[PDB]
């Protein structure tokens, strides 16, 4: 009753303002659930415009959430209990059950919207691989429910014109699965790296390119020919050697000096992306 | 716009390229209004997806057919006679599955 | 490279293919030769010259003054050559990569973690013992003939 | 019981094909 | 020799590049690597 | 770290150490693209309808909603919508840094350009 | 967004042009800053653009200008023995 | 002197990352077993549905 | 989560993921251990079997 | 009820006018499907004629449409939820 | 332990039932870390002077039947609770 | 105090160094009333664990580094050591003493 | 061979003729034209 | 060079004719099982139930 | 489990016993 | 199926193993 209610904790709770109109709930693609109505209407041979996958003709009455955790058992002899070890959470189930649909009167077929709903089995072929299918968001007024995804699905006919059902009952089932990663696998990656929360070898957290090696050596050769003088004389007699390189690691951007022979000789310092850092004195 | 086309159609705001290599046209001069433009469709397409062999004596490299790298295995075990040939051309057998006196 | 098949006919039609690396072609057939003179890196590379093969070695290896090959296959005897030396083969396509056994050879490291995409672990340990196991891992133990007569 | 016998037998050889297989 | 390629293989993974070279340039002081960020507009522009 | 709006002061664009600001600025920079106004990234930005009767002014506010939460993930928001006499839906976004334990305030704000 | 005729032809600011404009009093085209970082870069890209639209003329020995002589003078067959750089550019334009 | 079996959910990273010619670190787990390279003997690649 | 793409090339024809392969095996091996591949395929009337 | 249904659907699905005629249901061969009844009665020996295979007395009063699609779960340990991944679509019954 | 047939209803006050659904649902993250085990928070269920146990949340379920802007206002729970061995509270050292 | 701040945020009265190490602070000198404090978190000074690859002539090795604080808190009763490690500092028991 | 150079691309190079031409188009109310200065992340970005 | 594993209902002419002696001809399957004469190594009809 | 690891010895040694008694 | 081809496999393991130290 209201007078059993704990108004502690309803108090708590957010107050929603009546829509001005009655809503029904549908079903959206993925990433094109926080879309608008980008054409007044739908053109299928583009994607992401925000129409919804498929329309509810008729509210459900109610919507069932069953959510498992689940946790693994381990009975040692003569213990007073088991010992529970937490596994995994699970998965939530979304079932609603005896959805009306009623074109009788209207003497309109209802096969486009079962065929609308069975189409959620085939695989989605994207550049020319097949895929999984849609992943769907149950979409109702302001509320959504989940990344999900059609599970089962059964329809119970009981009136037809020509043969073309118009009165059935629809059962279906969604299951709540893990959201996807918006962010690019690369860019997690470099994210991951710029936080310095990865692994570290020595490396640097960009490998140079071809133009910053190009750049690279352009700044050590300058920094050499202005500091020629102040070299050691075992740097400055393999510089004087016409047949003497500078090279840079692609991964560490260490600098080293390359005599005639061909063979290492000395290390000149560091050079990330943007500056060079000789080495101390 | 090229990228408003190719985010719709294609999904990829990068993929514009393959609306301009469809059309020869430089995306830099002005379309005429009303004029008919070709947009490939991403169900019929050929994957841009880099081919690797993650385990190379150089630890990862690209290829790009995969016929001329070092998976190629169609001198492997060769018997230069002529038999072992035209079986290479129609099938390419490059094993042979006996060997036997009997 | 394909080497089997394998198919049910009447009820489940479903076909088995199998493939193998192209080391599966080095022990194909039993050999009997000898190699005098010759390092690790020349004797792999005639090998896998005889196969039409590429070869991956950067250390030339020692050089093998004298032995012979006696009802081997051409894998057997680089796989008894490569451990004598410390050597090991490895095939990735059509090339066979020969390394040096070192407890730091592997160039690139990959980490993972148990929380995230790990659904097994066993590990397992044993204390060493020459009752099992086979002749050449007692001889890569402390067992081996220490004593020869010249 | 029969039927598993053979199911496991058949699992068995599978098992050690894909070890003849495996191995260099 | 062989001819040059005048195209970049993949631009995005020239933006995540320039946003890492931002971190590298202010000595992992810059870590924004989201639209939401400030240089992010910028260098996908 | 620069923040959103570009403002040169005292001849270098403003560099701010607080995150607080930062963030604040975030949320600007999120409610100043639309989408499809930025090009590398066309999903990007607050999807905006203007000409329309408000019936369902709701599911703006909520798709808004989750936006903020999606990408700003360094703060904790609440949209509300109001209706306003001639035309006007007003937005307001309650937001709440979640490094900081008081609110703080920006001595830049103040400050008379 | 934009097309690229417009921001490299018309506006001739591939960078600044586009910049989001739609929410006006915060947007980047409601600070002069970004009209003003974005400048340099807009600068480089449409002199790029304008050398490579020339460029075929480049490939011209008649039109083209002097710094091209040299480079061309290998596809056209004249290497050192036959080809001379204190040759004057009418005569290596006509050769 | 040791020996790891490690059964896990393939991902991208996991699939070209993970050879014979790389280095293993393990975290997140005991303390014998973080911290030290574990050499890859041998990788298999299951795909028996999804 | 995992979106696959398989495609095998034998002989002169090729089998893609969702077509016929109904399992797929892998082997990386080092020393001891070879590469080796088991994949199944699912053969209307047995004619690739053929 | 109707003042509850969406008219936004309902007025976008295809109108069907009604035969006229108690129309039975019946069962035909496929490949058969596109086929009038070619002969006035049917001959067993001659293939593709365009016959029912099994002709209903009484129409059904309700039909039911199964459809299960097979997604796989897979249970990793210390996350909060299994990662499921599409296996097949499967048969309507 | 199960309670069946929880009551939640807030239709006349017009209060979404979201933030307490997705309270009881943020109950299958990880969220404690034990060691090297990161496990959902170890419950008690207490009642005014009654506990129950150290138990965690098995099981839960909703039935939603009244909705406003979607946001659901009534609904049937159930939950099962298990009772788990006590935590260690001195540490191992002591 | 500083052992407030430690209980609710750290769980453990002896993280507290951690906090002064965080600010800089004295603990001995007094906090004005008003001053701004940095209080980390529990879940989020795992993060400040920096791992990377040492190399060694036995072999390449993960280390952990961080400020000495958080690696005393996060070692408190030697839980992630291992027990071989334990045993090895005490394997040399008898300790060579001089007499005068 | 010997191609005639378009533009300039030295990384270096660009950072300062950027910070000296955002000088010029603002009429001098950017005055941070230091080549490793607090503009740095930006104009290396 | 081949191999088959036939399992089927023992009935009196595949146990009387299905001897190690004679040549099995099984027909009406893959094309290279249809005409060729495959050796019988080795019979066994094993009783169960019925 | 344990009982069933059991029946599997008990089934392969009694293959092994049937491959034993089946070869000359 | 595969599942407990593989729990066959991995008993049959732990039994020849068991076998190993089982004799002397």
Same mark, same amino acid.
Request: aromatic letters at 10%; hydrophobic letters at 35%; glycine letters at 6%.
């Given at each position: 009753?209201?007078?059993?209610?704990?108004?502690?904790?309803?108090?708590?709770?957010?107050?929603?303002?009546?829509?001005?109109?009655?809503?029904?709930?549908?079903?959206?693609?993925?990433?094109?659930? @926080?879309?608008?109505?980008?054409?007044?209407?739908?053109?299928?041979?583009?994607?992401?415009?925000?129409?919804?996958?498929?329309?509810?003709?008729?509210?459900?009455?109610?919507?069932?959430?069953?959510?498992?955790?689940?946790?693994?058992?381990?009975?040692?002899? #003569? @213990?007073?209990?088991?010992?529970?070890?937490?596994?995994?959470?699970?998965?939530?189930?979304?079932?609603?059950?005896?959805?009306?649909?009623?074109?009788?009167?209207?003497?309109?077929?209802?096969?486009?919207?079962?065929?609308?709903?069975?189409?959620?089995?085939?695989?989605?072929?994207?550049?020319?691989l097949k895929?999984?299918?849609?992943?769907?968001? #149950?979409?109702?007024?302001?509320?959504?429910?989940?990344?999900?995804?059609?599970?089962?699905?059964?329809?119970?006919?009981?009136?037809?014109?020509?043969?073309?059902?118009?009165?059935?009952?629809?059962?279906?089932?969604?299951?709540?699965?893990?959201?996807?990663?918006?962010?690019?696998?690369?860019?997690?990656?470099?994210?991951?790296?710029?936080?310095?929360?990865?692994?570290?070898?020595?490396?640097?957290?960009?490998?140079?390119?071809?133009?910053?090696?190009?750049?690279?050596?352009?700044?050590?050769?300058?920094?050499?020919?202005?500091?020629?003088?102040?070299?050691?004389?075992?740097?400055?007699?393999?510089?004087?050697?016409?047949?003497?390189?500078?090279?840079?690691?692609?991964?560490?951007?260490?600098?080293?000096?390359?005599?005639?022979?061909?063979? #290492?000789?000395?290390?000149?310092?560091?050079?990330?992306?943007?500056?060079?850092?000789?080495?101390?004195? | 716009?090229?990228?408003?086309?190719?985010?719709?159609?294609?999904?990829?705001?990068?993929?514009?390229?393959?609306?301009?290599?469809?059309?020869?046209?430089?995306?830099?001069?002005?379309?005429?209004?009303?004029?008919?433009?070709?947009?490939?469709?991403?169900?019929?397409?050929?994957?841009?997806?880099?081919?690797?062999?993650?385990?190379?004596?150089?630890?990862?490299?690209?290829?790009?057919?995969?016929?001329?790298?070092?998976?190629?295995?169609?001198?492997?075990?060769?018997?230069?006679?002529?038999?072992?040939?035209?079986?290479?051309?129609?099938?390419?057998?490059?094993?042979?599955?006996?060997?036997?006196?009997? | 490279?394909?080497?089997?098949?394998?198919?049910?006919?009447?009820?489940?039609?479903?076909?088995?293919?199998?493939?193998?690396?192209?080391?599966?072609?080095?022990?194909?057939?039993?050999?009997?030769?000898?190699?005098?003179?010759?390092?690790?890196?020349?004797?792999?590379?005639?090998?896998?010259?005889?196969?039409?093969?590429?070869?991956?070695?950067?250390?030339?290896?020692?050089?093998?003054?004298?032995?012979?090959?006696?009802?081997?296959?051409?894998?057997?005897?680089?796989?008894?050559?490569?451990?004598?030396?410390?050597?090991?083969?490895?095939?990735?396509?059509?090339?066979?990569?020969?390394?040096?056994?070192?407890?730091?050879?592997?160039?690139?490291?990959?980490?993972?973690?148990?929380?995230?995409?790990?659904?097994?672990?066993?590990?397992?340990?044993?204390?060493?013992?020459?009752?099992?196991?086979?002749?050449?891992?007692?001889?890569?133990?402390?067992?081996?003939?220490?004593?020869?007569?010249? | 019981?029969?039927?598993?016998?053979?199911?496991?037998?058949?699992?068995?050889?599978?098992?050690?094909?894909?070890?003849?297989?495996?191995?260099? | 020799?062989?001819?040059?390629?005048?195209?970049?293989?993949?631009?995005?993974?020239?933006?995540?590049?320039?946003?890492?070279?931002?971190?590298?340039?202010?000595?992992?002081?810059?870590?924004?690597?989201?639209?939401?960020?400030?240089?992010?507009?910028?260098?996908?522009? | 770290?620069?923040?959103?709006?570009?403002?040169?002061?005292?001849?270098?664009?403003?560099?701010?150490?607080?995150?607080?600001?930062?963030?604040?600025?975030?949320?600007?920079?999120?409610?100043?693209?639309?989408?499809?106004?930025?090009?590398?990234?066309?999903?990007?930005?607050?999807?905006?309808?203007?000409?329309?009767?408000?019936?369902?002014?709701?599911?703006?506010?909520?798709?808004?909603?989750?936006?903020?939460?999606?990408?700003?993930?360094?703060?904790?928001?609440?949209?509300?919508?109001?209706?306003?006499?001639?035309?006007?839906?007003?937005?307001?976004?309650?937001?709440?840094?979640?490094?900081?334990?008081?609110?703080?305030?920006?001595?830049?704000?103040?400050?008379?350009? | 967004?934009?097309?690229?005729?417009?921001?490299?032809?018309?506006?001739?600011?591939?960078?600044?042009?586009?910049?989001?404009?739609?929410?006006?009093?915060?947007?980047?085209?409601?600070?002069?800053?970004?009209?003003?970082?974005?400048?340099?870069?807009?600068?480089?890209?449409?002199?790029?653009?304008?050398?490579?639209?020339?460029?075929?003329?480049?490939?011209?020995?008649?039109?083209?200008?002097?710094?091209?002589?040299?480079?061309?003078?290998?596809?056209?067959?004249?290497?050192?023995?036959?080809?001379?750089?204190?040759?004057?550019?009418?005569?290596?334009?006509?050769? | 002197?040791?020996?790891?079996?490690?059964?896990?959910?393939?991902?991208?990273?996991?699939?070209?990352?993970?050879?014979?010619?790389?280095?293993?670190?393990?975290?997140?787990?005991?303390?014998?077993?973080?911290?030290?390279?574990?050499?890859?003997?041998?990788?298999?690649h299951?795909f028996?549905?999804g | 989560?995992?979106?696959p793409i398989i495609k095998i090339?034998?002989?002169?024809?090729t089998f893609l993921l969702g077509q016929?392969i109904i399992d797929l095996?892998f082997?990386?091996?080092?020393?001891?251990?070879?590469?080796?591949?088991?994949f199944?395929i699912?053969?209307?009337?047995?004619?690739?079997?053929?």
């Amino acid at each position: 009753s209201k007078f059993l209610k704990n108004r502690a904790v309803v108090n708590g709770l957010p107050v929603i303002k009546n829509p001005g109109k009655y809503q029904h709930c549908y079903l959206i693609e993925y990433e094109d659930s @926080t879309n608008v109505k980008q054409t007044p209407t739908e053109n299928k041979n583009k994607q992401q415009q925000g129409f919804p996958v498929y329309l509810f003709m008729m509210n459900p009455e109610n919507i069932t959430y069953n959510l498992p955790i689940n946790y693994q058992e381990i009975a040692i002899p #003569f @213990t007073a209990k088991n010992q529970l070890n937490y596994s995994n959470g699970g998965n939530i189930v979304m079932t609603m059950s005896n959805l009306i649909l009623d074109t009788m009167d209207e003497k309109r077929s209802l096969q486009p919207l079962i065929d609308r709903l069975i189409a959620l089995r085939e695989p989605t072929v994207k550049k020319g691989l097949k895929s999984h299918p849609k992943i769907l968001a #149950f979409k109702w007024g302001s509320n959504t429910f989940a990344p999900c995804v059609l599970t089962n699905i059964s329809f119970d006919v009981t009136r037809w014109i020509d043969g073309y059902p118009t009165k059935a009952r629809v059962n279906m089932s969604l299951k709540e699965i893990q959201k996807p990663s918006s962010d690019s696998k690369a860019l997690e990656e470099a994210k991951k790296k710029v936080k310095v929360e990865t692994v570290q070898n020595g490396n640097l957290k960009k490998t140079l390119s071809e133009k910053q090696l190009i750049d690279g050596v352009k700044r050590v050769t300058e920094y050499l020919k202005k500091n020629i003088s102040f070299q050691p004389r075992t740097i400055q007699n393999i510089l004087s050697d016409p047949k003497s390189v500078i090279k840079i690691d692609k991964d560490t951007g260490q600098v080293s000096l390359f005599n005639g022979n061909g063979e #290492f000789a000395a290390l000149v310092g560091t050079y990330n992306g943007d500056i060079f850092s000789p080495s101390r004195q | 716009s090229l990228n408003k086309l190719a985010t719709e159609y294609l999904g990829d705001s990068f993929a514009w390229q393959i609306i301009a290599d469809a059309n020869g046209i430089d995306p830099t001069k002005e379309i005429d209004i009303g004029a008919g433009l070709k947009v490939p469709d991403q169900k019929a397409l050929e994957n841009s997806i880099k081919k690797f062999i993650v385990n190379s004596p150089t630890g990862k490299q690209l290829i790009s057919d995969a016929k001329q790298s070092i998976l190629n295995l169609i001198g492997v075990g060769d018997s230069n006679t002529e038999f072992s040939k035209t079986l290479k051309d129609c099938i390419g057998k490059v094993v042979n599955f006996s060997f036997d006196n009997t | 490279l394909h080497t089997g098949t394998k198919h049910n006919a009447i009820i489940s039609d479903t076909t088995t293919f199998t493939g193998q690396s192209v080391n599966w072609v080095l022990n194909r057939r039993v050999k009997n030769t000898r190699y005098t003179g010759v390092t690790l890196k020349g004797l792999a590379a005639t090998i896998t010259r005889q196969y039409g093969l590429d070869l991956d070695m950067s250390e030339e290896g020692e050089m093998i003054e004298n032995i012979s090959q006696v009802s081997q296959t051409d894998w057997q005897f680089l796989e008894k050559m490569t451990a004598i030396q410390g050597f090991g083969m490895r095939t990735v396509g059509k090339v066979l990569q020969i390394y040096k056994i070192t407890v730091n050879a592997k160039k690139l490291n990959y980490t993972i973690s148990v929380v995230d995409n790990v659904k097994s672990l066993i590990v397992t340990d044993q204390a060493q013992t020459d009752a099992t196991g086979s002749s050449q891992k007692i001889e890569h133990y402390g067992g081996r003939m220490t004593t020869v007569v010249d | 019981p029969q039927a598993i016998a053979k199911q496991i037998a058949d699992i068995i050889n599978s098992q050690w094909q894909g070890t003849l297989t495996d191995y260099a | 020799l062989n001819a040059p390629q005048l195209v970049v293989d993949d631009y995005e993974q020239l933006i995540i590049d320039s946003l890492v070279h931002t971190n590298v340039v202010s000595n992992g002081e810059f870590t924004d690597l989201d639209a939401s960020g400030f240089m992010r507009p910028f260098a996908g522009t | 770290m620069y923040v959103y709006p570009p403002r040169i002061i005292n001849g270098t664009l403003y560099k701010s150490t607080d995150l607080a600001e930062y963030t604040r600025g975030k949320i600007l920079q999120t409610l100043s693209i639309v989408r499809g106004e930025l090009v590398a990234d066309p999903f990007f930005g607050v999807p905006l309808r203007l000409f329309s009767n408000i019936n369902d002014y709701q599911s703006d506010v909520s798709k808004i909603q989750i936006i903020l939460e999606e990408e700003i993930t360094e703060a904790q928001f609440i949209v509300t919508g109001d209706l306003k006499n001639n035309g006007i839906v007003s937005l307001t976004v309650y937001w709440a840094y979640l490094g900081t334990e008081n609110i703080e305030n920006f001595e830049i704000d103040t400050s008379n350009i | 967004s934009k097309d690229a005729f417009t921001a490299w032809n018309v506006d001739r600011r591939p960078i600044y042009s586009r910049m989001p404009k739609e929410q006006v009093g915060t947007s980047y085209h409601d600070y002069i800053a970004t009209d003003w970082l974005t400048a340099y870069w807009d600068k480089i890209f449409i002199e790029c653009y304008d050398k490579l639209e020339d460029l075929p003329r480049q490939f011209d020995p008649l039109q083209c200008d002097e710094e091209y002589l040299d480079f061309l003078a290998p596809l056209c067959g004249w290497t050192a023995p036959y080809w001379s750089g204190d040759y004057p550019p009418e005569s290596k334009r006509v050769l | 002197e040791f020996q790891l079996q490690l059964e896990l959910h393939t991902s991208q990273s996991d699939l070209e990352n993970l050879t014979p010619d790389t280095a293993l670190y393990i975290e997140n787990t005991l303390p014998f077993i973080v911290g030290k390279s574990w050499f890859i003997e041998s990788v298999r690649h299951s795909f028996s549905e999804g | 989560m995992q979106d696959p793409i398989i495609k095998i090339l034998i002989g002169n024809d090729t089998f893609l993921l969702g077509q016929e392969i109904i399992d797929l095996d892998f082997q990386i091996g080092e020393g001891k251990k070879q590469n080796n591949i088991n994949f199944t395929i699912f053969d209307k009337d047995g004619f690739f079997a053929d």
